[PDB]
RNA sequence: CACGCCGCGGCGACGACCCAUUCGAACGUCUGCCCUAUCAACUUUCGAUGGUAGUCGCCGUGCCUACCAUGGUGACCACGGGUGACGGGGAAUCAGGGUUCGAUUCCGGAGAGGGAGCCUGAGAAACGGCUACCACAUCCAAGGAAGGCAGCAGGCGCGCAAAU
RNA sequence: AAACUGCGAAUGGCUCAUUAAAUCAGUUAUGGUUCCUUUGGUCGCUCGUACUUGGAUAACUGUGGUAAUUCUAGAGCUAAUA
């Protein structure tokens, strides 16, 4: 049974005028535990939320009403589809699969998004909650009977749909696969079209390296070309928006619609959402405790579903599921492709530097030698100290245990206090410090890369890509994280960032990525936040815009009254 | 923005008109009047250009009756512009701007009224050929100025056709009012018709009137 | 209702089609046509219940369509086309011919007719006026309008018109002493002789018959047919001939 | 094992013969339609795909089995007057799945364009 | 469509001024409705009853306008109020009598959130039509756009109480 | 295929909120009115280019606006039981 809670709106409920009602007609309050606080010298009145049974009283004694009820989520086991194991994740619903349209799913991390895929895709018979005995595939169809979804597992049990899984974890995908682009893609297309797939993914540039060359943008690009040319009707797409930047994500949005035959089933699942008005048409959502149990909504449409998301509030339940809305000199590295020729900059102490680049641009081979490896040419600073350095691609190999890992291999004298309240206490490592690293999904593995990388001490911090593997809402946690440990350790940082949010809030110093983008380039001198976007966006040619009130950066439509006006004046983003 | 249409070859254009100093002889007058289009450019000197209509800032069109820069909402119906009913006799109250032109329209379409001297490099270099050609019977008379004797069906304009992988084949259009020996048997069909049915007035006529006297004989006996 | 009704639920149907409660919730309504909604059977129900030379609905339609069925030797393509009360139902690809007519209990019969009777039917004629020049016209019951009658016709007398031309060959006239038929209502379907008229003034006039048992009847004077002259009926009549036995001589008759 | 047929109605209209099948089958399962099709075409000097046969209800107690079939002239007034698919459960026709949702979600898509789009939009 | 006869033609689908009758609809007659007097007097010259002449309507008429008459209903219960009141065919009890129930699959009425006002049409005061006002709500580039499950399923909420 | 045209969308469905001589029921009337459709009547009754007449607009082609709709604007064609 879900559990009731009683919501005040500040407006008509002025309590000066209407003899303060609901205070005297409450049980709670009439034993004297205090749910309701009022007086009548007040504004508004106060309902506990920990001291409301949730009962309904209160609500016809008043006389402006202005008091809701309102549903705070728990755990149901009502309709249960999936449980994973004892003591473990419960996915609570199945999402409902729509023929031609595209369906898209935003939530928070560990709540069981990537779950639900497996299952719609015949890649999991569900256990339906019971991990002992297991029902097999009779009595799972005669579960989801008055359905449309027993007609569909049909289709899936006898293959008439067939069901092809873009992966979340991009990154390990060559260990699988050997030699070279050419000849991995192209055995496997099924379809001989090889001509919108490369030019509305930006490729062809890349099919004489191999496929274990590419760093993490283009190694996310190359796995939205397999999936597309294959021949099946069922596709999921796992974080589209990882690895990416923002002219190669609206790029990612239009070739996923260039999957929909109307016969064809298209579900995908973001953490970005500002695409997401031009990928998707109908939006469910998840909600629950994450990684104890996860439910589906119903699905809402493309510019319906993300509002009630940000509000946290979802109005077909009444559930609510939240209440929140010095120098160095330039060089010249050639890999074995093309060369990066650095223009030589200043640096500064105390100061944060964003890279601002493309898929391919250099920022995983300049975040190599600021660390004293690969330097061809003469020159190049050396720090003077140990460095710390994030890697991009976390393919961690280690023995046991986090507390092993994170806590006896690194500073066994520890430096708390002040080491846990300002830097572990908001990432959550402590939770799952029980855990193994080895068992970790992305969103914890980037998470717990990140505290060693904190937790060195060292002159120049090298960190890279906070954003990949995240939901949304812990990418602004992030931000608050690294702003206000190197400004007050005093030292400095280099970050590497994709996301338009993160890299707008922290930047003291920018560093811009300028050429052809992966066959010719050139980093910039260090130039300031407002210019310093303002050209690159003009790279771009994109422009950016904020929603008025709850700040979200919007891309304005390419030729339009608001682009082309902001285009004139060169402001392509508004106080940056 | 402009869009430039001419109307005798067929061939239109989008150009981007950018500085509005070049524009002013265009704002402060109504639709559908000829504008002296020298201004825009060097290579207009002799042609005049009609303000044809256009769209909105925000993209909603001109009506030619209503009378202001700004918007309004009209009550439109069947045989209005800017309208499409659903159903028989569906009015809705749409959002339209008035036939003023001023400079915040985002196109301004234009319709050349008379050629010039020059070539415009999109326009008057090429002519398209009017498809589908005439179908009714007077509308080729008329074009081909035929006679009282002469024949309608052989002067027909073909539409030569050709394909990629097809064998190529002329399509010519039914000729419709055209008096086939179908039609006189149906004229003469009706008119049969119209003899049958007054033969049968009169026969029912003189039949009755006979019974009738027959039966005031009868009636006349008491 | 804002507008006319199209459906025809089956229990407010009429009693004497003789339909099922559990074959559907629908019940074919009659075309508009000439006869009344109460008192006429439409083809789908006599092709499909009463000679069942269709099983299904689609069947009557698939036989309507090849231009099979006569109604009074004209061609009808609807399959709830009304026909009743000597409507010539005629079938020429097997060659028989049947007239609608109601047996004793109130029902409409298959009876079957001679291939030389299947000529003419008889027909109550309704209103009698004058027109546009002094035209006579004349309206059956069946809405069938003749110009040029016959001038001592009357209404509540009977005519017989060729079926193939639309022309009345004779009449009858409405006495005492003719043999008749009811079209009506609780004594519909007995055949007697007349006795009497009373004659009110403003309201429905009441017929006295007297049966060839002897027992007598009477019925309002909108639901008299005349069939015949004296005693002698014009048309093939069904085999109890309108004579009304009791519950106990039908039980009895059955065994 | 044995066909008894009531009653009897030839069908000048839809050119067939009426019956109503009687099997008496007193030691076995309910007999195959196939098998009562053959009995029946040699019984009545026909060919044995021209005659249908329908609703077999077998009585309680294992006794007979009674139902209706029918016996066309030829195979060309089959494919004209027989339901399809009483032809379709004689392979002699099948129809296109899609069948009632897709369709429908079909029809109200196709509403929402003009032109020549209606075909270039599924 | 059928095809010709020595000009003249057969069989049809479609068409309409009109008349008939066919589905009806609309307005009327006589008689019948549960509780209350702590509702015995009501109705008004701006319509309450009637007369004349019109307007209007599809037609009859205070339906409405002008002028004139002072009427109309009432303990045989008007008028006012209540109703967890849609009306009827019917239902459960039942010796005869009664008493109570009927939202509910058939008929008849009314309404599509509250009220209005209209377009087309033979037929509407239509809401799987439109125009506003009130009320509540969705998207927005804050310039604007679109709304109506008391249709089938479904979720919210209220509940003792109702399905894929 | 599309679009023009014609017809249907006023029946069916759902619920019972208003309504206590109102609804409704049996009864009687339209001689005080309308009626798409079907079915029969009528359609050389009239004493005054015709071997067939005119103008367009859709589908289509072509240029675009708007963030946004089953929004539609300009240019060029061609029909009718419009
Ligand atoms: N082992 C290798 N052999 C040959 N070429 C390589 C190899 N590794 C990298 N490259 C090339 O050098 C370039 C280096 O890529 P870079 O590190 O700039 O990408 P990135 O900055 O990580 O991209 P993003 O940050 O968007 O994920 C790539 O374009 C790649 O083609
Ligand atoms: N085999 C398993 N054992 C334990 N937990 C599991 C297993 N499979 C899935 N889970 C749990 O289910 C959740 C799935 O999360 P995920 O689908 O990655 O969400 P998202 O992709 O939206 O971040 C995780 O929190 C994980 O703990
Ligand atoms: S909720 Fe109660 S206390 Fe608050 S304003 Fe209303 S009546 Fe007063
Ligand atoms: S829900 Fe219950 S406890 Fe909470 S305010 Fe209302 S009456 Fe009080
Ligand atoms: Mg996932
Ligand atoms: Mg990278």
Redesign the pocket.
């Known amino acids: 049974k879900?559990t009731?809670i009683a919501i005040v709106n500040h407006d008509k409920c002025k309590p000066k005028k209407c003899r303060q009602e609901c205070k005297k007609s409450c049980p709670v309050v009439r034993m004297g535990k205090l749910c309701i606080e009022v007086t009548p010298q007040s504004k508004i009145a106060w309902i506990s939320e920990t001291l409301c049974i949730g009962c309904?009283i209160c609500?016809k004694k008043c006389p402006f009403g202005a008091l809701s009820?309102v549903?705070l989520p728990s755990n149901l086991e009502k309709e249960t589809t999936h449980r994973y194991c004892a003591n473990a994740f419960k996915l609570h619903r199945l999402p409902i699969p729509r023929p031609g349209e595209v369906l898209g799913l935003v939530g928070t991390n560990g709540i069981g998004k990537s779950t639900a895929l497996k299952i719609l895709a015949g890649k999991q018979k569900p256990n339906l909650g019971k991990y002992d005995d297991p029902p097999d595939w009779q009595e799972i169809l005669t579960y989801f009977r008055?359905?449309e979804l027993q007609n569909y597992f049909t289709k899936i049990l006898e293959d008439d749909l067939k069901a092809i899984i873009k992966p979340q974890y991009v990154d390990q995908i060559p260990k699988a696969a050997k030699g070279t682009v050419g000849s991995i893609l192209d055995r496997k297309d099924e379809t001989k079209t090889q001509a919108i797939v490369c030019q509305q993914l930006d490729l062809t540039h890349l099919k004489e390296r191999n496929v274990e060359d590419l760093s993490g943008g283009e190694l996310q690009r190359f796995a939205c070309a397999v999936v597309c040319i294959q021949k099946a009707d069922i596709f999921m797409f796992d974080e589209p928006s990882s690895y990416l930047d923002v002219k190669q994500r609206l790029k990612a949005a239009i070739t996923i619609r260039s999957l929909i035959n109307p016969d064809r089933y298209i579900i995908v699942v973001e953490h970005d959402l500002s695409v997401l008005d031009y990928l998707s048409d109908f939006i469910c959502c998840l909600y629950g405790v994450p990684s104890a149990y996860g439910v589906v909504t119903?699905p809402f449409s493309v510019?319906?579903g993300?509002?009630?998301f940000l509000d946290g509030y979802v109005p077909?339940?009444?559930l609510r599921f939240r209440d929140a809305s010095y120098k160095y000199p330039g060089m010249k590295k050639k890999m074995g492709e093309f060369e990066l020729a650095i223009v030589a900059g200043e640096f500064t102490d105390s100061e944060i530097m964003v890279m601002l680049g493309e898929n391919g641009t250099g920022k995983t081979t300049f975040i190599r030698m600021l660390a004293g490896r690969l330097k061809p040419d003469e020159g190049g600073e050396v720090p003077v100290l140990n460095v710390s350095y994030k890697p991009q691609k976390i393919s961690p190999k280690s023995t046991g245990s986090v507390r092993q890992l994170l806590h006896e291999k690194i500073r066994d004298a520890y430096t708390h206090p002040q080491f846990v309240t300002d830097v572990m206490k908001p990432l959550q490592i402590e939770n799952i410090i029980d855990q193994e690293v080895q068992t970790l999904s992305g969103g914890e593995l980037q998470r717990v890369a990140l505290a060693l990388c904190l937790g060195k001490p060292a002159d120049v911090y090298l960190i890279d890509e906070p954003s990949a593997y995240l939901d949304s809402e812990q990418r602004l946690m992030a931000a608050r994280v690294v702003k206000r440990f190197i400004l007050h350790a005093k030292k400095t940082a280099f970050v590497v960032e994709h996301d338009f949010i993160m890299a707008t809030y922290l930047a003291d110093r920018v560093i811009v990525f300028d050429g052809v983008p992966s066959k010719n380039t050139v980093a910039n001198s260090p130039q300031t936040l407002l210019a310093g976007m303002n050209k690159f966006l003009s790279q771009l040619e994109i422009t950016f815009?904020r929603?008025?009130?709850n700040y979200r950066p919007?891309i304005?439509?390419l030729?339009?009254?608001?682009?082309v006006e902001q285009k004139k004046s060169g402001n392509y983003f508004f106080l940056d | 923005?402009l869009?430039i249409?001419?109307?005798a070859t067929?061939?239109?254009?989008?150009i981007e008109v950018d500085d509005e100093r070049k524009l002013r002889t265009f704002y402060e007058k109504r639709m559908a009047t000829e504008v002296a289009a020298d201004a825009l450019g060097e290579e207009w000197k002799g042609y005049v250009v009609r303000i044809?209509?256009?769209?909105?800032?925000?993209?909603?069109?001109?009506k030619q009756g209503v009378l202001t820069h700004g918007?309004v909402?009209l009550?439109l119906?069947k045989g209005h512009?800017?309208?499409?009913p659903?159903?028989?006799?569906?009015?809705?109250?749409?959002?339209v701007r008035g036939c003023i032109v001023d400079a915040n329209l985002?196109?301004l379409?234009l319709?050349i009224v008379k050629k010039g001297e020059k070539d415009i490099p999109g326009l008057t270099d090429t002519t398209?050929p009017?498809?589908?050609?005439?179908?009714?019977?007077?509308?080729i008379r008329?074009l081909f100025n035929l006679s009282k004797e002469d024949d309608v069906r052989q002067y027909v304009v073909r539409k030569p056709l050709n394909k990629e992988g097809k064998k190529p084949r002329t399509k010519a259009?039914k000729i419709?009012?055209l008096?086939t020996?179908?039609?006189?048997?149906?004229?003469?069909?009706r008119?049969?018709?119209?003899?049958?049915?007054?033969k049968?007035?009169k026969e029912e006529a003189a039949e009755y009137a006979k019974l009738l006297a027959k039966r005031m004989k009868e009636a006349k006996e008491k | 209702?804002?507008?006319?009704?199209?459906?025809?639920?089956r229990?407010?149907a009429p009693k004497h089609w003789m339909l099922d409660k559990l074959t559907g919730?629908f019940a074919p309504r009659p075309?508009?046509?000439?006869?009344?909604?109460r008192e006429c059977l439409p083809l789908i129900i006599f092709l499909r219940n009463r000679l069942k030379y269709a099983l299904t609905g689609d069947e009557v339609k698939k036989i309507c369509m090849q231009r099979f069925i006569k109604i009074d030797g004209?061609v009808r393509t609807?399959i709830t086309?009304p026909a009743g009360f000597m409507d010539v139902i005629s079938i020429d690809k097997t060659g028989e011919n049947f007239r609608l007519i109601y047996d004793t209990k109130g029902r409409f019969a298959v009876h079957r007719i001679t291939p030389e009777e299947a000529k003419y039917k008889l027909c109550k004629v309704?209103?009698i006026f004058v027109?546009?020049?002094g035209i006579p016209?004349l309206?059956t019951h069946?809405?069938?309008?003749?110009?040029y009658p016959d001038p001592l016709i009357k209404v509540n007398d009977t005519i017989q018109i060729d079926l193939e031309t639309?022309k009345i060959t004779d009449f009858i006239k409405f006495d005492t002493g003719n043999l008749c038929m009811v079209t009506g209502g609780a004594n519909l379907g007995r055949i007697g002789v007349i006795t009497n008229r009373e004659r009110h003034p403003?309201?429905?006039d009441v017929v006295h018959v007297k049966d060839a048992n002897g027992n007598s009847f009477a019925t309002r004077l909108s639901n008299i047919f005349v069939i015949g002259k004296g005693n002698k009926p014009w048309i093939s009549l069904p085999r109890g001939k309108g004579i009304r036995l009791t519950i106990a001589e039908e039980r009895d008759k059955r065994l | 094992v044995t066909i008894r047929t009531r009653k009897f109605m030839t069908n000048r209209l839809l050119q067939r013969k009426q019956m109503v099948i009687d099997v008496l089958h007193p030691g076995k399962a309910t007999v195959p339609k196939t098998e009562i099709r053959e009995k029946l075409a040699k019984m009545y000097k026909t060919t044995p795909d021209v005659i249908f046969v329908f609703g077999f209800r077998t009585h309680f107690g294992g006794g007979k089995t009674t139902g209706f079939g029918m016996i066309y002239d030829s195979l060309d007034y089959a494919k004209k007057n027989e339901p399809k698919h009483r032809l379709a459960r004689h392979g002699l026709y099948e129809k296109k799945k899609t069948s009632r949702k897709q369709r429908k979600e079909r029809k109200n898509r196709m509403?929402?364009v003009?032109?020549?789009?209606?075909?270039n939009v599924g």
Do not use: W
Request: proline share 5%.
């Open positions: 879900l009731r309904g609500i009820i549903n008055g359905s119903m510019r319906e993300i509002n009630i077909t339940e009444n815009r929603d008025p009130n919007r304005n439509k030729n339009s009254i608001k682009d | 923005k869009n249409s001419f109307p067929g061939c239109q254009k989008l044809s209509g256009g769209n909105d800032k925000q993209g909603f069109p001109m918007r909402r009550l119906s512009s800017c309208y499409r659903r159903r028989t006799g569906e009015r809705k109250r749409k959002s985002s196109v379409n319709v398209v009017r498809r589908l050609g005439p179908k009714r019977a007077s509308r008329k259009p419709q009012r008096v020996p179908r039609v006189l048997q149906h004229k003469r069909r008119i049969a018709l119209k003899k049958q049915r007054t049968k007035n | 209702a804002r507008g006319p009704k199209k459906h025809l639920k229990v407010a919730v075309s508009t046509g000439p006869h009344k909604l004209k609807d086309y309704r209103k027109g546009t020049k016209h309206v069946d809405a069938r309008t003749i110009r639309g403003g309201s429905f | 509403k929402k003009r032109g020549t789009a209606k075909a």
